[PDB]
Symmetry: none
Subunit: 292 residues, 4 copies
């Protein structure tokens, strides 16, 4: 059998207005066309859904029960289409990537420039990682690949992992026009500190050397680019990933201000759960595994 979706809207409008002419005007169709479409729906369902002898027009019991059916059907259509709107606009080659913000901004330009033309060319859809739900999001298929720091769960089965890179958090401070750091670690007093939350991977790395440094937290944020901006504004010092300050480190805007003992090793991976992605997803995974 078959059911036409516009008939559901027709029946809902008719049940609400209780008038064939008004419901036809609301549905942008002529009155006989609306009547005939209502009768087509009634034949398709197999019962009279509208009492013909009632003025104003009322619904039969079967129509009362089919109101709920039509409402749930329209709502399900609208939801299953809204959830596919963004994926359909990007095409069948869309690859959903959740990522840490800095990892995204650092790696995705190279991945995008590494794409070859063709019918299976990957179209990236990148979203900020949900630090609390990224694992379940990877398990349920809401994203294909996850660019994230070292994680004892994501790196092990049932998930697949590829070590993308291993860099270091550098304690850095702004500089004057002579290239000399504004804040040091040679003083009896502490230094204005732009910290992460300990609830984050980078914060867990920073808290290892927390005892041997004099710090005074004046700003907290897990957004490492926020801390980088506040470092550039001479507000304080911060442990920043090496891949995110290369421009400012080459120039004399920022300087490392610690012993080699304060450089904190970090490493970031690409994680996946599905043993088999669509061809675009597998090409993205291969490009990640081969990012030089």
């Amino acid at each position: 059998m078959n059911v036409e979706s516009k008939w559901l809207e027709d029946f809902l409008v008719l049940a609400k207005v209780k008038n064939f002419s008004q419901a036809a005007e609301l549905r942008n169709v002529t009155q006989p066309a609306f009547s005939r479409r209502i009768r087509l729906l009634e034949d398709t369902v197999g019962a009279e859904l509208v009492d013909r002898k009632s003025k104003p027009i009322e619904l039969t019991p079967s129509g009362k029960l089919f109101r709920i059916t039509a409402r749930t059907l329209v709502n399900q259509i609208e939801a299953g289409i809204s959830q596919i709107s963004d994926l359909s606009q990007l095409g069948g080659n869309v690859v959903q990537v959740a990522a840490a913000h800095s990892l995204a901004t650092s790696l995705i330009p190279k991945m995008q420039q590494a794409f070859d033309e063709g019918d299976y060319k990957p179209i990236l859809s990148v979203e900020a990682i949900d630090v609390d739900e990224a694992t379940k999001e990877l398990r349920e298929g809401a994203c294909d690949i996850l660019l994230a720091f070292d994680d004892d769960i994501l790196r092990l089965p049932p998930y697949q992992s590829q070590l993308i890179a291993k860099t270091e958090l550098l304690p850095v401070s702004a500089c004057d026009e002579m290239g000399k750091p504004i804040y040091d670690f040679i003083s009896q007093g502490a230094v204005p500190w732009l910290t992460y939350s300990s609830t984050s991977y980078i914060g867990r790395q920073v808290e290892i050397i927390r005892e041997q440094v004099a710090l005074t937290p004046i700003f907290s944020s897990s957004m490492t680019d926020m801390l980088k901006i506040l470092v550039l504004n001479k507000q304080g010092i911060a442990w920043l990933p090496a891949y995110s300050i290369q421009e400012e480190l080459a120039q004399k805007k920022v300087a490392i201000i610690g012993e080699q003992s304060l450089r904190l090793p970090i490493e970031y991976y690409a994680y996946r759960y599905q043993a088999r992605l669509h061809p675009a997803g597998e090409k993205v995974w291969s490009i990640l595994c081969n990012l030089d």
Copy 2:
């Protein structure tokens, strides 16, 4: 837009068999016609659902989600039509009543013989209450009248309530052939107790006097019919509604034990949400409001 469940079944069969020819054969249509229906669904939804560039035919990222969407839509359509088959058979005077099992078995035989004759006489369609969902069903129109116990939400607006009756739960036990209660509350020996769920309405009445008597819960069930049967089998005492043990009390099969304080007052109502029902529904409502 206008979606046809034809296309939904087509897409489900295609995602199952991973082959346009096999799916077309299983749908009793020619391969070009099946391809046209699939492309029509794709153009309607605005999404490429299948990847034709691969063998076997896999799904797109949008296709994987829309498969779930379409399966849900098809199941809902089938369920709604199967529901409407039954409700149409009864007629236009059908009144859908969700009722507590005991209240149903006690009251509906009285309501049926109170029905006058004529083509406005109601045809009752009675089903057991979904307690977690009967309020929603009453608001949606899935049932016309609700025969239930005292409820703080259903008694108040936006629902109409009518106190049908105010009776009492009696702690009873079976009797021997001479009429003597086998179990009683004058002993240290813990009495075998047939209890309700302490989350149901009746359990929440026995909970107020439980710390007053000594009982060992040996059996639990929300079905007062079940507890009554087990009482008559000399398995233990139970608080049964007075309206369900009238003949057993009159025939000395069961006996009330304890003091007057152990009799627990309960009230039961008829609830509705629609301000104006069909004539048979209003007839059922008026009979409920004038019942004894």
Copy 3:
């Protein structure tokens, strides 16, 4: 470490009333005891949760964040205890059985009388089957065993099934004092029919012989005891399970009113999902598999 649950309520009351004396009076403890318990909570958490210099007393930021923690903790405690209230009252030998109403009322007396005394004596907790969610309820562990009619899904893996019995639905009618049926099938006119919904197993069985019988539906209900009551009240005829009318069939209250072709074969099973239940559950399962 350790956290005391009463301290959470103490902190909530204190945050709401902003006064140590009022919060102590609300918590039924003296003022110094409440102050000391608040300080114990503050030491346990590791931060001052209350500003001491504010009048009225206000919370530190850490207290603002710990409000949510304490609220979620109290709510989780209350929910995980309410869900275990009925199971704890029955003891560690409770066996959760979902069942069809007639199957429950017919089988559970025998199962209850078949129990041997001992430390692993089963305590039954029986609830009416959720026709829409009984399968998932059996999968998630909300019930241990399911007494239900023939089901193509529950009878097959991953579920275990044991055919309890095979009986027949009999089309039955009330009788006069001579033992003769009031309604027959020998007439050109139809007979008042007390039907189930086709949405039920018994209704699906009845609809097989629907063509060869003249019927006029005057009442609908899936509760077979409701239809049985209405049969006893000379309202109509109904297909009733043989196990539920044995008393009325032995006496002359009810009579079968059809050819052998109208007797509809049905069979009911015990279903389970867990490969290993607690000892009481396994004893109940064995008694079911050995119910003669």
Copy 4:
């Protein structure tokens, strides 16, 4: 009652190892002390949690559910304490701000230098908005102020809103070394388009003029930082907020394309729920209300 998480950890370890001696050893307590703690938890909750009559020790029906309950409680306790560690370190003048990433990076450096001195100076703790949960966080007190875009729920009561600014999204593309925009809207050739999620606030602004220009979505991301980076890499055009491309426009790295109609007006606000915050919170609010 009074529950201690000591007992919860005890019960979890016992349900894991299925042995009282091993669980007692893993808890650094003697076996009698561990047994006493387990029985104390059982008496508190009012439920037998373990079956001591079997080897190895299994769980009771109540114990299986209370294991999940206790694991949830322990995880919530640990999370709350770890949260409070960070928030205590900052001080009493910490202001928790959930902000859209672009708004954060644009506004917070301005707010930081606008802070006056004194022991009432705020310490900002800024985190990216959980759009599906920021309203709930603001109502619960998880954050003090919300730097977000125009929202129909947050702008109206029971929340306080202040229009911080009214700017516009500009369709921009990268330039060559001479300052000429590489991509433009005067051609049939579909322009590579770096789009937002059409469910985000900014995507819902580009959706109103999408059917006016011809674009091919080659990349998707809700992070306007990511889209800006990909624009500067000559990958395509994008609608970027004016406040995020000021220097790139001034340095002719990017260029605005299209007509005035393609500039899309957007507004961003600061939201709050509490009527009276701590002095640092009110200072942050007043700075937000007087910002330019």
